[PDB]
């Protein structure tokens, strides 16, 4: 059961949880990858990795993915959380040069991941390994789109670095725009496509019903993370959180801000329910009697189904993962799974 302040009865009643059959092997294989790529200290991997639930988060989302696609996605997701931790620690310790150099290497590795598979920075080498595998599933046009999206994500992380080093809390609207980039909304959306085995043409994925369903799934995930990660973020001097923007710029108390974030999250669900109908009608229209139409219809339907699964996977992840359990830590500002 979930605490009342975080509970979403519509998720519990109407978004039943799903789990990909590869999850048990996924859990161990990603743990071993974190150890072998030296992305976290060995003792922290053994003590904390399974409890962080990163593989569970992906296995509740990309249902139907081939096992090797899911493995690359899960390794990438675990990497992404470690990168968020590295960025945080570079900020806390004032390592502006180390951050700048990492940022530059990630831009280069994103365009040429094979060149960086054995880089001396293990964080760069692990990024490159996951991305090179992601680049092997679909035509290079998809790879180029993933790269365009992730270049933007890296720069949003750089903006967060600047904000936190200057002590700036973004305004609410500025924050909502930035959050689509720091949460990597378009990366998770891109990854729907190798999971269903089809690169969608621009005309299909830019259809208004597809686009809006994709957006709402990610807005829910990011803002629900803001709701659940607010305690650890306040304790860690993080400034990027819708609740923090509301407290800072709209003069809300903590209780009022929690209520407002909750209401915005709830609205994503019922807006998604409306647009999902339109997205599934579009999927039906794509089934025009042709083979290609059947393929595109099935891919769109699978992708919209996984946009729905993201809601339940993110919901339960936030109650299971050790990442957010700040009340258990000796130092609330320093999670035990980060290298400090
Ligand atoms: O777990 P966290 O740190 O609350 C977070 O969700 C980590 C994260 C980063 C990017 C994508 N998904 C999760 P963040 O975005 O930093 O608020
Ligand atoms: Mg974070
Ligand atoms: Mg972050
Ligand atoms: Mg957060």
From Swiss-Prot:
Domain of life the protein comes from: Bacteria
Binding site for Mg(2+) 2: 84, 88
Cofactor binding remark: Binds 3 Mg(2+) ions per subunit. Can also use Mn(2+) and Fe(3+) but less efficiently, and other divalent cations such as Zn(2+), Fe(2+), Co(2+), Cu(2+) and Ni(2+) are nearly completely inefficient as cofactors.
Binding site for Mg(2+) 3: 225, 229, 233
Short name of one Pfam family: Terpene_syn_C_2
InterPro entries linked to this entry: Isoprenoid_synthase_dom_sf (IPR008949), IsozizSyn (IPR054543), Terpene_cyclase-like_2 (IPR034686)
SUPFAM superfamilies: Terpenoid synthases (SSF48576)
UniProt xrefs under Gene3D superfamilies: Farnesyl Diphosphate Synthase (1.10.600.10)
Biological or metabolic pathway of the protein: Sesquiterpene biosynthesis; epi-isozizaene biosynthesis
Keyword annotations of the record: Lyase, Magnesium, Metal-binding
Swiss-Prot/TrEMBL catalytic activity: (2E,6E)-farnesyl diphosphate = (+)-epi-isozizaene + diphosphate
EC number, as in UniProt: 4.2.3.37
GO molecular function terms attached to this record: epi-isozizaene synthase activity; metal ion binding; terpene synthase activity
Enzyme class per UniProt: lyase
Binding site for Mg(2+) 1: 84, 88
Motif (DDXXD motif): 84-88
Cofactor section: Mg(2+); Mn(2+); Fe(3+)
Family: Belongs to the terpene synthase family.
Annotated domain remarks: The Asp-Asp-Xaa-Xaa-Asp/Glu (DDXXD/E) motif is important for the catalytic activity, presumably through binding to Mg(2+).
Function (record text): Catalyzes the cyclization of farnesyl diphosphate (FPP) to the sesquiterpene epi-isozizaene.
Protein name: Epi-isozizaene synthase
Organism: Streptomyces coelicolor (strain ATCC BAA-471 / A3(2) / M145)
